A paper describes a structure:
The LPs are localized to the OM where they are attached via a lipid anchor by a process known as the localization of lipoprotein (Lol) pathway. The ABC extractor presents the extracted LP to the transport protein LolA, which binds the anchor and thereby shields it from the hydrophilic periplasmic milieu. As most Gram-negative bacterial pathogens, the genome of the phytopathogen Xcc contains genes coding for a tripartite Lol system with an ABC-type extractor, the LolA chaperone and the OM insertase LolB.
In the present study, we present the experimental crystal structure of the LP-free LolA-LolB complex from Xanthomonas campestris pv. campestris. The crystal structure of the Xcc LolA-LolB complex was determined in the trigonal crystal form R3 with two LolA-LolB heterodimers in the asymmetric unit. LolA-LolB heterodimer 1 (LolA1-LolB1) consists of chains A and B, and LolA-LolB heterodimer 2 (LolA2-LolB2) of chains C and D. In both heterodimers, LolA and LolB interact in a “mouth-to-mouth” orientation with the LolB hook inserted between the two β-sheets of LolA, similar to what was first proposed by Okuda and Tokuda. An annular opening is formed on one face of the LolA-LolB complex. In the lipid-free LolA-LolB complex, both paths that lead from the annulus to the hydrophobic cavities in LolA and LolB are closed off. The LolB hook (residues 74–79 in chains B and D) assumes slightly different conformations in the two heterodimers to allow some conformational freedom when docked to LolA in the absence of bound lipid. Due to the different conformation of the LolB hook in the two non-crystallographically related heterodimers, LolA and LolB in heterodimer 1 (chains A and B) are slightly more tightly associated than LolA and LolB in heterodimer 2 (chains C and D).
Author numbering:
A (entry chain B): 19 to 198
B (entry chain A): 1 to 125, 129 to 188
């Protein structure tokens, strides 16, 4: 690895880890086996706390998942029946919609960071020293395209594909919002 | 009077083609999502929502199946077309008798936004409540509120009455490489 690329990737991660409140908006397509779905995603993060709104296309019906990565619990509002909650936010979402998304790991993966206290992650770098693929926690995460940098905003992913067996997530991040 | 407008508008209506703009707002009216494109309707169960800006997305109801296609994501979701009048009342225009069947229709007295409104309160199971706003050129606005208070306001313009549709207006044509998935539950 280039020494200038080594320092740039270390400063990218340290900047992101030092600014734990952020949000993004984008579009997601989920798949497991032959079924799946898609919709517009708003993701707000405040340290370990996430607030995730998915706005559906024809149904017009959004759901809102709220959870906490330190406990893993989450609650899901907006669906017919009323609000569902449980110890595993990924499983709450799975039982209610049939969608698999690893919600407790996304806050790190979507920023191209690996989870802390999770078990050594295999990391492959692109030719610039940016993560290209991350293997962690059963999931393989590919970083296909990057959002341009600016003085205020470090390089952050723009197109991700994550897979675990036959569970597939494709994510387009259209707009990041970060601390100043 | 607003029911006058709906019946003047859908008087002898077999097809409809026009443009839309969509604003999704939060409780305090701040826009959270805004987009625009083309919408087409034809009796008795065919519609097409063509988002153009800021990204392309195509929704097509061919009469038997509903397709949600996102080109940037290279995936289309397909499901059978059941009762799509409780997911978009816009189809209940080309068949105006449907409205009173699944919706407890009710006419607001106060004109709003410059328009005469109909409240579409739902009986069949969707959304929490719709509202159709009529002005000088017919249907001008549609508003839907979901269970978590998020409102979608759709405006219309350039309505073309009973047009000559290309024979794939209401068909989904897959492109190479696209993943075709069912609707998960």
């Amino acid at each position: 690895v280039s020494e200038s690329a080594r320092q740039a990737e270390a400063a990218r991660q340290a900047w992101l880890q030092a600014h734990p409140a952020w949000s993004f908006q984008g579009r997601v397509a989920i798949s497991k086996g032959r079924d799946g779905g898609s919709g517009r995603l708003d993701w707000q993060q405040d340290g370990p706390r996430y607030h995730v709104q998915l706005s559906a296309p024809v149904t017009r019906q959004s759901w809102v998942l709220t959870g906490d990565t330190t406990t893993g619990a989450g609650r899901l509002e907006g669906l017919d029946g009323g609000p569902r909650a449980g110890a595993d936010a990924e499983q709450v979402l799975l039982e209610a919609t049939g969608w698999t998304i690893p919600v407790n790991q996304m806050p790190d993966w979507v920023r191209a960071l690996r989870i802390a206290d999770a078990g050594a992650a295999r990391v492959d770098l692109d030719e610039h020293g940016r993560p290209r693929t991350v293997q962690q926690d059963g999931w393989t995460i590919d970083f296909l395209e990057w959002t341009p940098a600016s003085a205020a905003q470090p390089e952050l992913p723009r197109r991700i594909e994550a897979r675990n067996g036959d569970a597939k997530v494709r994510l387009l991040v259209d707009q990041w919002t970060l601390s100043p | 009077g607003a029911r006058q407008e709906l019946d003047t508008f859908t008087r002898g209506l077999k097809g409809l083609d026009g443009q839309f703009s969509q604003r999704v707002t939060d409780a305090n009216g701040r826009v959270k999502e805004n987009s625009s494109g083309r919408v087409a309707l034809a009796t008795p169960r065919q519609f097409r929502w063509e988002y153009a800006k800021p990204y392309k997305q195509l929704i097509v109801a061919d009469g038997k199946k509903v397709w949600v296609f996102d080109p940037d994501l290279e995936q289309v979701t397909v499901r059978a077309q059941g009762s799509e009048e409780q997911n978009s009342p816009l189809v209940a225009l080309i068949d105006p008798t449907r409205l009173d069947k699944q919706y407890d229709v009710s006419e607001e007295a106060a004109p709003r936004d410059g328009l005469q409104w109909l409240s579409l309160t739902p009986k069949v199971d969707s959304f929490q409540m719709a509202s159709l706003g009529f002005g000088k050129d017919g249907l001008a606005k549609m508003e839907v509120v979901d269970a978590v208070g998020q409102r979608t306001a759709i405006s219309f313009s350039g309505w073309k009455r009973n047009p000559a549709f290309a024979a794939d207006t209401f068909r989904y044509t897959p492109g190479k490489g696209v993943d075709v998935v069912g609707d998960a539950q």
